[PDB]
CSV table of C-alpha atoms and ligand atoms in Angstrom, one decimal:
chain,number,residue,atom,x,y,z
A,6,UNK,CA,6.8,1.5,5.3
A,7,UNK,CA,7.3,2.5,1.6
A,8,UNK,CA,8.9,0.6,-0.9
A,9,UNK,CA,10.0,1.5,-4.4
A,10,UNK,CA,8.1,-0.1,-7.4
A,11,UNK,CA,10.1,-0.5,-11.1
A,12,UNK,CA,8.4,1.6,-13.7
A,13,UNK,CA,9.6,2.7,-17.7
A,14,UNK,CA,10.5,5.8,-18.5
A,15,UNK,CA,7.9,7.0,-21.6
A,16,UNK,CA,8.5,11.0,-21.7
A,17,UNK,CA,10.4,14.0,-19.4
A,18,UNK,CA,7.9,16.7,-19.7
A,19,UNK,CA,9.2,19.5,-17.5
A,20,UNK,CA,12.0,19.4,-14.3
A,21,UNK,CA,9.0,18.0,-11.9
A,22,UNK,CA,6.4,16.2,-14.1
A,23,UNK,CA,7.2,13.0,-15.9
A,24,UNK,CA,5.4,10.4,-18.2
A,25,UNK,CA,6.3,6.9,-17.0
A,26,UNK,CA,4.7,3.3,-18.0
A,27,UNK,CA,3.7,2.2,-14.3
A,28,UNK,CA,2.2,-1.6,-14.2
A,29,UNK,CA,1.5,-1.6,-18.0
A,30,UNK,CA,-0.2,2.1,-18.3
A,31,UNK,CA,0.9,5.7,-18.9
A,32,UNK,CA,0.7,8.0,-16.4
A,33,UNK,CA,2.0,11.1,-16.0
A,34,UNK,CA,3.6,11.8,-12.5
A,35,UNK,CA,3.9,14.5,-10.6
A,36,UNK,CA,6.8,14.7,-7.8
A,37,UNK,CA,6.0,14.8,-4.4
A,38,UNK,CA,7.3,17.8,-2.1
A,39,UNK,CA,9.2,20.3,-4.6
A,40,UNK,CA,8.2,22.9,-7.2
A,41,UNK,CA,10.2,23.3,-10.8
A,42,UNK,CA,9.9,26.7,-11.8
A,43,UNK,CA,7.1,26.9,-14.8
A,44,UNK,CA,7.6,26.6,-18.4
A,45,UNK,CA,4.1,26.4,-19.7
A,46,UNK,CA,0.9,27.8,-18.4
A,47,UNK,CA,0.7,31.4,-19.9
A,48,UNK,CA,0.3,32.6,-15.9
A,49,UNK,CA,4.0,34.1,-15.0
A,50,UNK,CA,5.0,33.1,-18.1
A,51,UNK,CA,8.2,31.0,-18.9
A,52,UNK,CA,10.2,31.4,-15.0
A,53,UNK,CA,13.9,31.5,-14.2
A,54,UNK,CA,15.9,28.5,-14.1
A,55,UNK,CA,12.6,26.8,-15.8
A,56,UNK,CA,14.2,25.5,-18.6
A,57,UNK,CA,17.5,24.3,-16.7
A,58,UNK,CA,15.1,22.6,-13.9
A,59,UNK,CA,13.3,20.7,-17.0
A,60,UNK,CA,17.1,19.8,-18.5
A,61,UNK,CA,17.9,18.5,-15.6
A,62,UNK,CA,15.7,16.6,-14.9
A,63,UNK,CA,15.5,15.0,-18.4
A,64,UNK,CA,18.6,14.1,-18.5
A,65,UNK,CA,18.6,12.3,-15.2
A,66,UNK,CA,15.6,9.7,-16.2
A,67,UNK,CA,16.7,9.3,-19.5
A,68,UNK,CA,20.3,8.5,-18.8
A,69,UNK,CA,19.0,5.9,-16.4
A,70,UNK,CA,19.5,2.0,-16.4
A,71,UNK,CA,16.5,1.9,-13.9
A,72,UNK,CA,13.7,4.3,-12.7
A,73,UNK,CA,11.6,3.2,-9.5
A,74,UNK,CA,8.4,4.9,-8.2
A,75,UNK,CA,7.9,4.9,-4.8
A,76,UNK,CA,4.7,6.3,-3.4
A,77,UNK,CA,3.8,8.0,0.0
A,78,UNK,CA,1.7,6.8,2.6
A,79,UNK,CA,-1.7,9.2,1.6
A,80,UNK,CA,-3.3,9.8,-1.8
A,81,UNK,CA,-1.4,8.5,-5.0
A,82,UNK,CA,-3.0,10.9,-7.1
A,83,UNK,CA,-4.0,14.7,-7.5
A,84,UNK,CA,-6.7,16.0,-8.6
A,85,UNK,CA,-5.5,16.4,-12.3
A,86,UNK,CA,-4.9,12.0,-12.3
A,87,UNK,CA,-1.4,13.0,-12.1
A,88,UNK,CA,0.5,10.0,-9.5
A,89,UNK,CA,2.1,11.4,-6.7
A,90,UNK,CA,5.5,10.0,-5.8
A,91,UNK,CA,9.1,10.1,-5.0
A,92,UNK,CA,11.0,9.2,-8.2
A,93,UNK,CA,14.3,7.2,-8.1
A,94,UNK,CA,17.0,6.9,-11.5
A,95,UNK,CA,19.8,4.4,-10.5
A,96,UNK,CA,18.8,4.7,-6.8
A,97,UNK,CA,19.0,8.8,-6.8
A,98,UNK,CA,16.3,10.4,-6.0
A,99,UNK,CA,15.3,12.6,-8.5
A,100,UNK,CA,13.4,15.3,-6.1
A,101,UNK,CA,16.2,15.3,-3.9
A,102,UNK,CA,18.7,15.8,-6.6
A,103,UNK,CA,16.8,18.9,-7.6
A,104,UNK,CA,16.8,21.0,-4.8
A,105,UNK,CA,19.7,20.1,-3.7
A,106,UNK,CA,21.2,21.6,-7.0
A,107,UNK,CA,18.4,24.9,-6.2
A,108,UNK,CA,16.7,23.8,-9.6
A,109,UNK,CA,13.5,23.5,-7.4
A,110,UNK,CA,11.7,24.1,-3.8
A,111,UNK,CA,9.9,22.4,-1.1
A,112,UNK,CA,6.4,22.7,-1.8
A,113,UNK,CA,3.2,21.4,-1.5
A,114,UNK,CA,3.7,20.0,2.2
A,115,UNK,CA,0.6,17.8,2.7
A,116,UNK,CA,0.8,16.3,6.0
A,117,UNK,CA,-0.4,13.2,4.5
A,118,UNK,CA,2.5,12.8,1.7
A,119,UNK,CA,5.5,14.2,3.5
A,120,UNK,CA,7.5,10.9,4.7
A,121,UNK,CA,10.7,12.7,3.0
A,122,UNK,CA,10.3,15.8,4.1
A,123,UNK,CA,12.8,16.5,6.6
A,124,UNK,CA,15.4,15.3,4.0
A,125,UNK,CA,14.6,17.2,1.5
A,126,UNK,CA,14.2,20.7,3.8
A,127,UNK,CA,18.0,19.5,4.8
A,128,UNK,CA,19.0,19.7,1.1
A,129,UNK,CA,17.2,22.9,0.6
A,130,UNK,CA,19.4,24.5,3.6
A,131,UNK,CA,22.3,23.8,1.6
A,132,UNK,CA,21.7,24.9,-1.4
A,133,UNK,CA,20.3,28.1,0.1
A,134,UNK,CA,23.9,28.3,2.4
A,135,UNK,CA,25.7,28.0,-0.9
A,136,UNK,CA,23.5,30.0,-3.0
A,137,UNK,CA,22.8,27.6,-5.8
A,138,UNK,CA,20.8,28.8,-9.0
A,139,UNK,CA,17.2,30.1,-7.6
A,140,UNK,CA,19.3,31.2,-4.3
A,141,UNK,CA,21.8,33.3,-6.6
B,1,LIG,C1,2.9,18.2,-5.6
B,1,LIG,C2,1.4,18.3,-5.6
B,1,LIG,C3,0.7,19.2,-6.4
B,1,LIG,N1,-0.6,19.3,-6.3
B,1,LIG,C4,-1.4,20.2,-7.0
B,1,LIG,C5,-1.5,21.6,-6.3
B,1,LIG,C6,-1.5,22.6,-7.5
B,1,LIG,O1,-2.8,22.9,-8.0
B,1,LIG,P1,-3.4,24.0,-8.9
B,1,LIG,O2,-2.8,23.8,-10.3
B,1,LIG,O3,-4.9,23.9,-8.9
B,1,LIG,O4,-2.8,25.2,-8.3
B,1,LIG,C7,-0.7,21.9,-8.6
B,1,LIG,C8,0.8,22.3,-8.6
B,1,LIG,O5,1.5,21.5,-9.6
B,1,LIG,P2,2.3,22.2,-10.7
B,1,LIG,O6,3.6,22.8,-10.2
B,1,LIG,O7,2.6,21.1,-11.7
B,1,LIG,O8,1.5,23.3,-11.4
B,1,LIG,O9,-0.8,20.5,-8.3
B,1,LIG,C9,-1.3,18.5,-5.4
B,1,LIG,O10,-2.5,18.5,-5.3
B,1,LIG,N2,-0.6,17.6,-4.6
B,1,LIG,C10,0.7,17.6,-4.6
B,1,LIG,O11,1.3,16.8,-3.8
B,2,LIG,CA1,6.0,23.2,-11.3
């Protein structure tokens, strides 16, 4: 069973990667299951909806009172050291809250991370069905 861990938020750095003090170091996380359009490798460039996917999620962890980390049942980090977890601001989950607004996809399904991934493919339905953002 997972379980959600309290954590501080230090930085938003783009809609799906975050800098968080976890258990008294930085880390930059990476959020499991969905992809935020890109806003700064030089390959594709700046993408559509990048920017709003990065406000987004910005302003969701920093208007927060409490963020929790909550990791998956398989590896906790990539291969950049980036932690791989579900992210939750006042008991939301952020990577929920993002597709279901079609600021992101589900993405990188590793059959060892992918506890939430039903939910999530459920929220992406729906903001398909209604045609939200990056299903304009
Ligand atoms: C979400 C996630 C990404 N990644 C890796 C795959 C991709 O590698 P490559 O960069 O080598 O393509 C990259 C996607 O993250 P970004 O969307 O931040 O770029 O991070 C994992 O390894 N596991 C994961 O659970
Ligand atoms: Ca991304």
């Amino acid at each position: 069973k997972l379980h959600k861990e309290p954590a501080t938020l230090i930085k938003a750095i783009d809609g799906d990667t975050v800098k968080l003090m976890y258990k008294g170091q930085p880390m930059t996380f990476r959020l499991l299951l969905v992809d935020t359009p890109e806003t700064k490798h030089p390959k594709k460039g700046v993408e559509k909806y990048g920017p709003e996917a990065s406000a987004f999620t910005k302003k969701m962890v920093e208007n927060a009172k409490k963020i929790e980390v909550e990791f998956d049942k398989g590896q906790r980090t990539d291969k950049y050291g980036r932690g791989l977890a579900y992210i939750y601001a006042d008991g939301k989950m952020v990577n929920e809250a993002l597709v279901r607004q079609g600021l992101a996809k589900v993405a990188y399904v590793y059959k060892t991370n992918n506890t939430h991934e039903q939910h999530l493919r459920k929220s992406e339905a729906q903001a398909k069905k209604e045609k939200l953002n990056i299903w304009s």
